[PDB]
């Protein structure tokens, strides 16, 4: 049979929390991708064209995590690439075609299998121009990468060395198509919210009629990004030619306090479980009270670093305990109360 | 041999909404071939070479017109990319490779290659740029333009004889580029700004003065026809390069009428793709006439060309596709105009 | 360090140095410790021209992101320069610990 | 050329362009005609004019021979611009009022 989007989303839900829209988009794409892979013959006069995805979201939202979870559940080849390393042809940094090479390795150099593959290009917002203007200098690590990726996304034949470039002069480089390869470009666009505000939040003058929100009513990045359109991306630095290749624009919402509380315990590799495991191999049992998790979420939200903030709050609270816990003997359980997060109290210890 | 009417007819079958550009391409192609037949032309006067220059926004038929032309014509046709090209002796690529690929398409028939076409896409990407301190050297630029210029002006090009082995006997057969047709294209993003400054004097302030609003901004659509060689030079092209390309085929932005045709008229139209997708899933997909008009209006607003259509359709059917496999006993899906706006959700027949 | 594609040393060179310590044992290097000193010398110039690129400061931060978090980085054996058509030693930095440091000057004013 | 960055390379390129048309013949290239356009626009780019006049007065330029991946410094062809005729053009709209 074929995995349905509901099944795919459930597997993503095990590791990801709160990104419903993005999960739907990825599930639908993977299902459609499998449908095309099965109906390769396509006994009809219609070529099923792909739709590339563009993930946008703040830090610690779950973009890279979604891609990682997807790789675990993907039968077809999947590779993760970084746009930072890529450079336009003829430069020291790298060649865009390397991604495909990385993909072939996952497929044991089976071109037919690689063509029907998925690619996740992370940090796509870091190859963007500073303004809508075309350029002022050769932007190698920037628009140059976007210009190079156009053919790779739309579809073309890329050369690839099978084993080694130095084994033979030409080595009969492999020709692999990309018209069917799916691309998921994910980046945490910083400053895009400001661009959308200028286009949406009009009437921001000085008089009575002007509206002043005092950073309280102001819509957050999660709500603002939902209203993203291609014109906003052009101003951010993307090329119009590059967005057209990425029609599907999925947005991830900012993680709320309730979501952070869920992240601490519900996921498979939840933060609390990691610390519990660290203590468990040490012979100790770590218990987190519900009140503590609520406190950690409030503190982490202030950092504005996403879910990663949680690690800072937890590590800081357990720093003193982890330092002197091995020296201590006969300690079997550790309890963290709400006061411990504030720093007023010391974590309670159980001996036995 | 081919007639311009025939060329335009074949192009219209696959391209929609570029009537003027198709005319210019057909006229230029026909005239170029007639020039090759009558080399002497029984006259001392020499006709200027007609090399097309395609300028149009994203998703307007630039890379499609070239492909459709190749399908019709029998002569060789190669589709290169300026992004890959680099200055000689660099890792990226060489310009001579273009002729090499052209011969491979023509089965190494030098006589046939000299009568071939060459399409260079993304030509705007090699635009001249100011020197960067950190970069070692700017190879993907002016240098490439000069190589293409010497190729367009007409010069012999050495191609290896099929690369039989390490030593190919150094035959290095010569190929003449004086009779080759070049079609340089690319969306000159930011050219509208240069043109605007040149041809716009602003607005007045008095009563009699004609105040111009944003709706009268005169964007790229209808603003690229006024382009002159001075604007291209500011964009980064070489003056001599422009002179070699007298023909300038401009593609206007796709109107709503053209977009609606693209949704249904093509054999591999967007609507047909989703219908096939649903059909292999045991479901029938129906698109209402009003829905197509709404999709085109949204796509036109995006200013992404015809590619925008996929974005609109994908969003409308995102929820339906997510829960259609789980839904059972569903044989037909109907999309109304409201579904595109999002107020309603698409009627599903449970029969 | 500098952003990829420029004349300065690349960010993957760090891993190369680590390989030297481990006799080019990738499995032994993936579990190493790394100390990046002078991390305050790579910082965005808030008041700067918009159209420009801070290859030295912002680019380095951008590049280190996947490295710190963890990725399968390409590591030239020697590490002098990156060449696209060159053999690379794939290293995973998901288990490598990083200890960045730096005397932030003017932070007391910001606080 | 108004950019005023690495003007020596830009002005030298002019000579390189002439050699390509000249078939890399130093004697024939030295007899060539160079036409410069929009010379009025640079006026106000003093540095641009200074670089140009050195080329107009006459100097020896090093041009790489027949391209090549890498070639030694000495191999570079030495052409003299003192023997090359330079024509400078341009429209001077404001100049009429000045007169």
């Amino acid at each position: 049979a074929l995995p349905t989007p509901h099944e795919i989303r459930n597997h993503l839900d095990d590791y990801v929390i709160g990104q419903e829209q993005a999960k739907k988009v990825l599930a639908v794409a993977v299902y459609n991708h499998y449908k095309r892979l099965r109906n390769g013959d396509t006994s009809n006069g219609v070529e099923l064209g792909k739709s590339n995805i563009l993930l946008i979201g703040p830090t610690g939202s779950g973009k890279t995590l979604l891609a990682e979870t997807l790789a675990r559940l993907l039968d077809v080849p999947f590779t993760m690439a970084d746009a930072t390393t890529l450079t336009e042809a003829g430069y020291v940094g790298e060649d865009v075609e390397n991604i495909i090479q990385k993909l072939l390795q996952k497929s044991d150099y089976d071109v037919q299998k690689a063509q029907r593959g998925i690619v996740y290009i992370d940090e796509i917002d870091k190859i963007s121009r500073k303004s809508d203007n075309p350029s002022i200098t050769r932007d190698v690590s920037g628009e140059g990468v976007q210009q190079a990726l156009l053919k790779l996304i739309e579809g073309t034949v890329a050369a690839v060395p099978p084993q080694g470039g130095r084994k033979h002069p030409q080595q009969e480089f492999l020709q692999v198509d990309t018209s069917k390869i799916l691309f998921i470009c994910g980046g945490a666009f910083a400053g895009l919210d400001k661009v959308i505000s200028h286009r949406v939040e009009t009437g921001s003058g000085i008089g009575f009629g002007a509206t002043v929100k005092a950073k309280s009513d102001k819509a957050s990045e999660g709500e603002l990004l939902a209203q993203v359109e291609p014109e906003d991306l052009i101003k951010f630095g993307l090329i119009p030619e590059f967005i057209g290749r990425l029609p599907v624009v999925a947005t991830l919402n900012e993680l709320s306090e309730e979501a952070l509380i869920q992240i601490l315990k519900e996921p498979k590799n939840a933060l609390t479980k990691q610390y519990q495991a660290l203590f468990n191999l040490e012979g100790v049992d770590l218990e987190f009270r519900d009140e503590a998790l609520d406190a950690i979420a409030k503190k982490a939200m202030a950092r504005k670093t996403g879910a990663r903030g949680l690690r800072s709050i937890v590590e800081a609270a357990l720093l003193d305990t982890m330092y002197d816990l091995p020296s201590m003997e006969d300690v079997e359980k550790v309890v963290i109360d709400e006061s411990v997060i504030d720093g007023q109290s010391e974590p309670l210890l159980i001996y036995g | 041999l081919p007639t311009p009417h025939e060329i335009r007819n074949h192009l219209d079958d696959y391209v929609i909404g570029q009537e003027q550009a198709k005319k210019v391409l057909a006229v230029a192609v026909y005239n170029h071939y007639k020039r090759l037949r009558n080399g002497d032309t029984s006259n001392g006067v020499e006709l200027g070479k007609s090399n097309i220059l395609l300028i149009g926004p994203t998703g307007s038929g630039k890379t499609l017109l070239a492909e459709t032309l190749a399908r019709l014509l029998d002569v060789p046709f190669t589709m290169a990319d300026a992004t890959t090209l680099t200055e000689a002796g660099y890792v990226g690529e060489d310009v001579e490779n273009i002729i090499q690929k052209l011969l491979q398409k023509s089965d190494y028939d030098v006589q046939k290659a000299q009568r071939g076409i060459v399409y260079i896409d993304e030509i705007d990407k090699i635009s001249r740029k100011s020197d960067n301190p950190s970069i070692t050297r700017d190879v993907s630029g002016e240098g490439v333009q000069q190589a293409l210029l010497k190729l367009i002006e007409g010069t012999v090009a050495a191609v290896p004889p099929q690369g039989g082995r390490k030593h190919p006997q150094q035959e290095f057969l010569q190929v003449d580029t004086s009779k080759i047709l070049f079609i340089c294209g690319g969306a000159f993003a930011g050219l509208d700004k240069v043109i605007s400054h040149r041809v716009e004097t602003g607005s007045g302030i008095g009563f009699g003065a004609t105040v111009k609003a944003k709706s009268d901004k005169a964007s790229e659509g209808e603003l690229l026809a006024q382009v002159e060689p001075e604007d291209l030079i500011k964009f980064g092209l070489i003056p001599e390069f422009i002179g070699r390309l007298p023909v300038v085929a401009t593609l206007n932005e796709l109107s709503e009428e053209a977009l609606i045709q693209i949704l249904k008229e093509p054999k591999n139209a967007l609507t047909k793709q989703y219908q096939a997708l649903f059909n292999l899933e045991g479901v029938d997909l129906e698109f209402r006439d009003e829905a197509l008009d709404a999709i085109a209006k949204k796509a036109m607003a995006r200013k992404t060309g015809a590619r925008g259509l996929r974005s609109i359709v994908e969003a409308a059917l995102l929820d339906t596709m997510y829960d259609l496999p789980s839904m059972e006993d569903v044989e037909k899906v109907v999309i109304d105009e409201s579904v595109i706006d999002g107020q309603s959700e698409p009627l599903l027949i449970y029969g | 360090l500098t952003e990829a594609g420029y004349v300065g040393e690349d960010v993957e060179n760090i891993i190369q140095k680590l390989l030297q310590k481990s006799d080019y044992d990738v499995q032994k290097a993936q579990r190493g410790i790394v100390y990046i000193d002078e991390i305050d010398k790579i910082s965005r110039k808030s008041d700067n021209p918009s159209i420009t690129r801070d290859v030295s400061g912002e680019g380095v931060q951008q590049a280190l992101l996947k490295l710190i978090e963890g990725t399968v980085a390409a590591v030239p054996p020697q590490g002098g320069r990156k060449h696209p058509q060159q053999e690379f030693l794939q290293v995973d930095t998901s288990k490598i610990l990083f200890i960045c440091g730096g005397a932030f000057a003017g932070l007391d004013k910001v606080i | 050329l108004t950019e005023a960055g690495y003007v020596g390379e830009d002005v030298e390129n002019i000579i390189q362009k002439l050699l390509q048309k000249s078939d890399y013949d130093v004697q024939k290239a030295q007899r060539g005609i160079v036409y410069i356009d929009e010379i009025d626009k640079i006026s106000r780019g003093e540095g641009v004019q200074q670089a140009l006049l050195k080329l107009i007065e006459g100097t020896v330029a090093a041009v790489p021979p027949q391209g090549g991946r890498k070639h030694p410094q000495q191999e570079f062809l030495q052409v003299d611009t003192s023997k090359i005729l330079f024509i400078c053009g341009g429209a001077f709209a404001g100049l009429d009022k000045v007169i």
């Binding site: 430069y91 | - | 060449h83 058509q85 | 991946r69």
Partner: peptide, 7 residues
């Protein structure tokens, strides 16, 4: 069999 130059 060295590689080509890179900027």
């Amino acid at each position: 069999e060295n590689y080509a130059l890179a900027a």
